[PDB]
Design a protein around this ligand. Structure first.
Ligand SMILES: *[C@@H]1O[C@H](CO[C@@H]2O[C@@H](C)[C@@H](O)[C@@H](O)[C@@H]2O)[C@@H](O[C@@H]2O[C@H](CO)[C@@H](O)[C@H](O)[C@H]2NC(C)=O)[C@H](O)[C@H]1NC(C)=O
Ligand SMILES: *[C@@H]1O[C@H](CO[C@@H]2O[C@@H](C)[C@@H](O)[C@@H](O)[C@@H]2O)[C@@H](O[C@@H]2O[C@H](CO)[C@@H](O)[C@H](O)[C@H]2NC(C)=O)[C@H](O)[C@H]1NC(C)=O
Ligand SMILES: *[C@@H]1O[C@H](CO[C@@H]2O[C@@H](C)[C@@H](O)[C@@H](O)[C@@H]2O)[C@@H](O[C@@H]2O[C@H](CO)[C@@H](O)[C@H](O)[C@H]2NC(C)=O)[C@H](O)[C@H]1NC(C)=O
Ligand SMILES: C#CCN1CC[C@@H](CN(CCOC)C(=O)c2ccc3ccccc3c2)C1
Ligand SMILES: *[C@@H]1O[C@H](CO[C@@H]2O[C@@H](C)[C@@H](O)[C@@H](O)[C@@H]2O)[C@@H](O)[C@H](O)[C@H]1NC(C)=O
Ligand SMILES: *[C@@H]1O[C@H](CO)[C@@H](O)[C@H](O)[C@H]1NC(C)=O
Ligand SMILES: *[C@@H]1O[C@H](CO)[C@@H](O)[C@H](O)[C@H]1NC(C)=O
Ligand SMILES: [Cl-]
Length: 526
């Protein structure tokens, strides 16, 4: 099966899915390899080819440091790249239903990874089930991460910042110019992403250069107003200079610094990335989105507050235990191999790990609002409090605040609270419904009966897949046929949200109200 794209023909491959067929084009290039003098620059247009490009395997993932904290453990290594790392990584993937659709809605996945890691080839991002089950086209792309994607000298085109966001954007541009050749409808494109991918999706809502490249947006556990999502001008400068010094590229002409960094092997850049910050945390984003004056014209909190974003529908949600995954990457007393009962003193120590630059008073204020218990004799009180601190501050409260502020400008928004813990979750039970572990349900992995998911999980994934496809196609994430709970729009007044679980799917109001008032109204002052 051959498709003629604007830059040349590509050959895909047939996939057997659920007694049917999906056509996969894995690894289509969408930009000139950003090598040599193109390292740190915006992605350049692709020179046409006349051959038949073989898009029959995932391409290189972008250079990145690997999570080595739990070698051999599926819970962590399932997020590590599964193809060769290379600077030659600007490729995308296309899953089209078979028989070829005539005008299918397109879903474009943007992976997360703290803007430092990630790849579109992960097993949990496999789009073949969505193409099979919902007859949508699924697209995903690799975009540059870390310093190679987000090194910033604002205004300098040799390293302007936000290159990995421009990679994503050039990929959306490719879909606009090419997806009709695949049976896709360029006028019906939904972006969806998780974590940094969701923060990226929300930044495309703000970026005028992306306005015309998609229709709607889904944001899973992330948004640009999360405290880790946007690097300020002061930090980005200090971090660029610190990388220069660590590598021996300190110059006075900033363009000469970039030339010097261009001769460094990718590995040398990657090993010094960790140390450009004096006090890191498990949530550090050393090199991420910045206000560059190109992709992002102003501080995005101002743009959100003042209604300067694409007017469209959004689907936003978070997981019940967003915070716990980060606790075993540094908080004292925590371990994935025991139940991590921690003491008051260990809790206080954990706050220093997660809020290193925060004053004594600020850390006391966190402790005060999170450690007023009903039964102060529950041994896991402090363990659960620290997970909630990290999850509320980094994910849940920013997602709610984004959704309130976005919906105040007239658009339908839908908010979900995902609270099913996967029966196949390799992490221990105390970590709960972890960050990232809704993704496999969104992509329909539990629809594969040959896997070890329960029947309740197949049904839950089936409903979520239908709701996501209905949102993409029609702007309304309902399941209209199986007597499902109707999903009400989220309004800034009543703030209704839908819970997603195997048992009872419920309409609730004002998620984490007391906690988010602390983080959203108080904590920014300290
Ligand atoms: C494919 O369908 C589009 C319409 O898509 C719908 O409308 C969009 C605005 C958006 O809401 C999507 O989610 C919907 O699915 C057809 O678009 C028409 O195209 C012609 C020619 O370009 C144009 O004159 C009309 O104005 C378009 N109608 C619109 C914009 O509403 C398009 O023709 C279909 N293409 C194929 C090949 O089937
Ligand atoms: C801005 O950067 C300076 C320099 O960072 C140091 O050098 C880098 C190459 C890298 O190795 C970092 O880990 C180093 O810390 C920071 O100043 C340092 O701050 C720490 C702790 O605050 C202190 O112990 C060091 O002695 C400082 N070194 C110097 C030369 O001042 C500074 O903190 C950074 N600013 C911010 C806001 O983070
Ligand atoms: C849970 O485990 C942590 C981490 O300890 C490591 O992993 C364990 C599963 C086990 O294999 C240990 O050998 C490892 O050290 C425990 O925290 C440690 O506690 C010891 C007590 O001797 C202390 O000296 C260390 O500093 C701690 N390690 C840290 C803070 O990283 C914790 O006590 C265990 N909790 C429970 C309830 O079993
Ligand atoms: C460092 C570190 C360890 N973490 C702990 C948990 C785990 C989170 N995963 C894995 C992918 O699950 C979606 C990330 O990729 C990741 C890494 C850093 C982030 C920084 C800010 C916001 C989100 C982040 C997400 C990796
Ligand atoms: C690109 O692929 C071409 C065809 O691939 C081969 O033939 C098809 C029908 C399948 O059987 C497939 O698995 C086979 O590999 C090759 O002829 C051609 O050389 C390839 N181009 C390369 C490798 O640069
Ligand atoms: C820095 O170097 C560049 C490239 O060689 C040059 O164009 C630019 O003018 C230089 N700037 C200064 C201040 O010397
Ligand atoms: C609705 O229920 C039937 C079983 O009665 C099932 O086959 C079908 O796929 C369900 N659809 C969705 C979208 O959940
Ligand atoms: Cl308060």
């Amino acid at each position: 099966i051959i498709i003629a794209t604007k830059n040349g023909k590509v050959r895909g491959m047939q996939l057997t899915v659920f007694g049917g067929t999906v056509t996969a084009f894995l690894g289509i290039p969408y930009a000139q390899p950003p090598l040599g003098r193109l390292r740190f620059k915006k992605p350049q247009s692709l020179t046409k080819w006349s051959d038949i490009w073989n898009a029959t395997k995932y391409a290189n993932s972008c250079c990145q440091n690997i999570d080595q904290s739990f070698p051999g453990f599926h819970g962590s290594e399932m997020w590590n790249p599964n193809t060769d790392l290379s600077e030659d990584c600007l490729y995308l993937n296309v899953w089209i239903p078979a028989p070829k659709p005539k005008n299918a809605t397109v879903l474009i996945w943007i992976y997360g990874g703290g803007f430092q890691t990630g790849t579109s080839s992960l097993h949990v991002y496999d789009g073949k089930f969505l193409a099979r089950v919902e007859r949508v086209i699924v697209v995903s792309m690799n975009y540059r991460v870390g310093a190679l994607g987000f090194l910033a000298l604002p205004g300098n085109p040799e390293a302007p910042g936000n290159m990995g966001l421009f990679d994503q954007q050039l990929a959306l541009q490719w879909v606009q110019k090419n997806i009709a050749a695949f049976g896709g409808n360029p006028k019906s494109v939904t972006l969806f992403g998780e974590s940094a991918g969701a923060a990226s999706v929300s930044l495309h809502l703000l970026s005028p250069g992306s306005h015309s490249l998609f229709t709607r947006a889904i944001l899973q556990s992330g948004s640009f107003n999360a405290p880790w999502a946007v690097t300020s001008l002061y930090e980005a400068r200090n971090r660029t200079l610190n990388l220069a010094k660590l590598t021996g590229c300190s110059r006075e002409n900033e363009t000469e610094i970039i030339k010097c960094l261009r001769n460094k092997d990718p590995q040398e850049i990657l090993l010094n990335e960790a140390f450009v910050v004096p006090y890191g945390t498990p949530l550090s984003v050393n090199f991420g989105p910045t206000v560059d004056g190109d992709f992002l014209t102003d501080m995005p909190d101002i743009l959100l507050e003042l209604g300067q974003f694409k007017k469209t529908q959004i689907l936003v949600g978070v997981n019940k235990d967003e915070g716990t995954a980060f606790l075993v990457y540094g908080a004292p007393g925590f371990s994935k191999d025991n139940n991590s009962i921690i003491t008051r003193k260990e809790f206080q120590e954990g706050l220093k790990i997660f809020f290193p630059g925060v004053s004594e008073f600020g850390k006391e204020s966190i402790l005060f609002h999170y450690t007023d218990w009903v039964d102060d004799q529950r041994p896991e009180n402090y363990r659960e409090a620290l997970g909630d601190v990290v999850g509320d501050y980094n994910f849940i409260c920013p997602a709610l605040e984004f959704t309130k502020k976005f919906s105040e400008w007239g658009n339908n928004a839908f908010f979900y609270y995902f609270e099913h813990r996967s029966s196949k979750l390799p992490w221990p039970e105390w970590m709960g419904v972890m960050h990232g572990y809704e993704i496999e349900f969104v992509f329909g992995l539990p629809l594969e009966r040959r896997d070890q998911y329960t029947k309740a999980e197949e049904i839950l994934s089936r409903s979520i897949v239908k709701r996501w496809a209905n949102f993409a196609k029609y702007g309304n994430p309902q399941e209209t046929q199986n007597q499902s709970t109707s999903w009400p729009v989220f309004k800034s007044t009543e703030q209704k949200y839908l819970t997603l679980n195997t048992e009872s799917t419920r309409i609730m109001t004002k998620l984490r109200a007391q906690q988010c008032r602390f983080w959203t109204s108080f904590f920014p002052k300290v």
